[PDB]
Amino acid sequence: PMVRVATNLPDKDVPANFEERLTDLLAESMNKPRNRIAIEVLAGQRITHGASRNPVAVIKVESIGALSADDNIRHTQKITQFCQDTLKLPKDKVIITYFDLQPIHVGFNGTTVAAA
Amino acid sequence: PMVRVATNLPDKDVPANFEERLTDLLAESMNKPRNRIAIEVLAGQRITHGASRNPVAVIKVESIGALSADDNIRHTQKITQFCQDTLKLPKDKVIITYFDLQPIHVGFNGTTVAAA
Amino acid sequence: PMVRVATNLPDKDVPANFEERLTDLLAESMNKPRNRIAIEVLAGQRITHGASRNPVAVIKVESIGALSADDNIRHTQKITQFCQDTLKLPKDKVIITYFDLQPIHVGFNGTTVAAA
Numbered sequence: 346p347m348v349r350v351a352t353n354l355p356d357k358d359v360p361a362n363f364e365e366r367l368t369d370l371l372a373e374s375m376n377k378p379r380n381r382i383a384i385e386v387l388a389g390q391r392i393t394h395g396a397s398r399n400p401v402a403v404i405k406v407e408s409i410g411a412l413s414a415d416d417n418i419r420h421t422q423k424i425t426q427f428c429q430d431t432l433k434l435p436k437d438k439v440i441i442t443y444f445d446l447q448p449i450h451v452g453f454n455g456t457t458v459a460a461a
Numbered sequence: 462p463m464v465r466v467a468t469n470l471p472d473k474d475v476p477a478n479f480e481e482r483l484t485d486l487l488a489e490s491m492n493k494p495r496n497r498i499a500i501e502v503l504a505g506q507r508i509t510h511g512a513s514r515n516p517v518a519v520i521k522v523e524s525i526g527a528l529s530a531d532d533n534i535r536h537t538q539k540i541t542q543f544c545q546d547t548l549k550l551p552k553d554k555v556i557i558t559y560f561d562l563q564p565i566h567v568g569f570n571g572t573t574v575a576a577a
Numbered sequence: 578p579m580v581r582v583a584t585n586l587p588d589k590d591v592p593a594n595f596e597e598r599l600t601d602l603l604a605e606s607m608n609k610p611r612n613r614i615a616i617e618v619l620a621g622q623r624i625t626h627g628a629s630r631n632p633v634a635v636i637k638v639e640s641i642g643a644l645s646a647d648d649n650i651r652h653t654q655k656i657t658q659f660c661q662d663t664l665k666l667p668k669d670k671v672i673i674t675y676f677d678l679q680p681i682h683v684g685f686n687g688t689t690v691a692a693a
């Protein structure tokens with residue numbers, strides 16, 4: 346899984362253990378090994394929602410599978426509660442997009458996943 | 462809609478009202494509510510186009526629908542004109558990718574849009 | 578092609594010719610014109626892989642075709658080698674996602690590529 350979390354909260358408000366904790370959360374919920382999860386964090390960024398600059402996170406989650414309709418309900422509930430607990434965001438200021446990828450469209454260790 | 466606008470123009474050159482005006486523009490062009498529109502702006506960034514560092518914008522627009530072939534002609538005309546007016550970019554310096562999402566792949570308010 | 582290279586390596590460590598040389602690399606690999614290749618470089622960013630902050634690059638490659646299964650093996654080999662050479666990254670610290678776009682989802686010069 347490859348996750349990007351962007352927020353307009355400052356970098357000092359996104360704790361240093363955020364990526365590690367999010368890596369544990371997605372490992373368990375997506376059944377993926379920790380060494381196949383990458384997390385990008387972009388804090389202090391300009392972001393609006395409804396043109397408001399109130400605190401918000403916009404997250405992208407890519408994975409090869411593990412993204413059925415029902416799995417995404419569960420990942421959304423978990424990531425949303427996690428951002429509430431760690432970033433203090435309201436439950437309605439966490440916007441997530443999922444991308445279910447084929448292994449032909451992922452490169453790792455110098456070739457595609459499909460070709461590994 | 463979840464929109465990301467990246468530019469090599471300095472942050473001081475993307476006016477504070479950019480997100481507001483672009484929110485209004487996309488609400489009208491996509492027939493989407495203002496409170497379902499998020500805009501990320503990333504200025505001051507390293508970007509090249511044909512390896513040139515001349516001013517350019519690279520924009521991603523995600524939406525659940527409202528992205529037909531015909532719709533996308535209208536969004537591109539409107540966004541490209543808006544970047545020309547506000548950022549002074551040439552008409553051939555605004556690069557846009559559209560992602561038409563299913564509602565099972567968007568998380569908002571703690572569950573998927575499909576499950577809401 | 579529209580390529581995003583994010584890395585936790587500092588900006589001073591990503592050479593000023595990085596984008597020139599990647600633009601040549603992608604033009605030859607994908608058989609796409611140099612003036613249809615944009616690259617975004619986001620260095621100095623928070624990234625973990627397996628929760629490690631060791632040096633890593635997370636890259637997204639979007640293209641109107643040229644991303645067959647076999648094509649993606651070649652692009653992964655070349656881009657991974659290229660990051661080993663220029664950024665001093667290990668082979669297993671280069672994570673790539675490919676997105677194969679329809680021309681109705683790409684806006685350039687004020688209209689879609691499909692409608693050019």
Ligand SMILES: NS(=O)(=O)c1cc(C(=O)O)c(NCc2ccco2)cc1Cl
Nearest residue numbers: 346380381382383408409451453458672
């Ligand atoms: N190991 S796997 O086939 O389940 C696998 C699964 C995935 C996946 O994203 O599901 C993947 N994504 C790219 C990546 C992220 C971090 C390191 O490589 C790579 C691999 Cl090898």
Ligand SMILES: NS(=O)(=O)c1cc(C(=O)O)c(NCc2ccco2)cc1Cl
Nearest residue numbers: 440462496497498499524525567569574
């Ligand atoms: N209201 S809606 O069902 O048309 C809707 C539609 C969309 C959409 O993107 O089309 C959407 N994207 C996620 C989001 C962006 C900003 C706040 O939530 C969310 C919702 Cl709830």
Ligand SMILES: NS(=O)(=O)c1cc(C(=O)O)c(NCc2ccco2)cc1Cl
Nearest residue numbers: 556578612613614615640641683685690
């Ligand atoms: N020339 S083309 O039809 O093969 C073409 C191909 C692509 C493509 O991405 O394959 C494309 N992407 C948008 C873009 C990137 C840089 C400048 O415009 C645009 C065009 Cl016009």
Ligand SMILES: [Zn+2]
Nearest residue numbers: 356357388623
């Ligand atoms: Zn920091």
Ligand SMILES: [Zn+2]
Nearest residue numbers: 411412413416
């Ligand atoms: Zn599942």
Ligand SMILES: [Zn+2]
Nearest residue numbers: 391472473504
């Ligand atoms: Zn600013």
Ligand SMILES: [Zn+2]
Nearest residue numbers: 396481482485
């Ligand atoms: Zn307004």
Ligand SMILES: [Zn+2]
Nearest residue numbers: 507588589620
């Ligand atoms: Zn620099």
Ligand SMILES: [Zn+2]
Nearest residue numbers: 597598600601
């Ligand atoms: Zn060259």
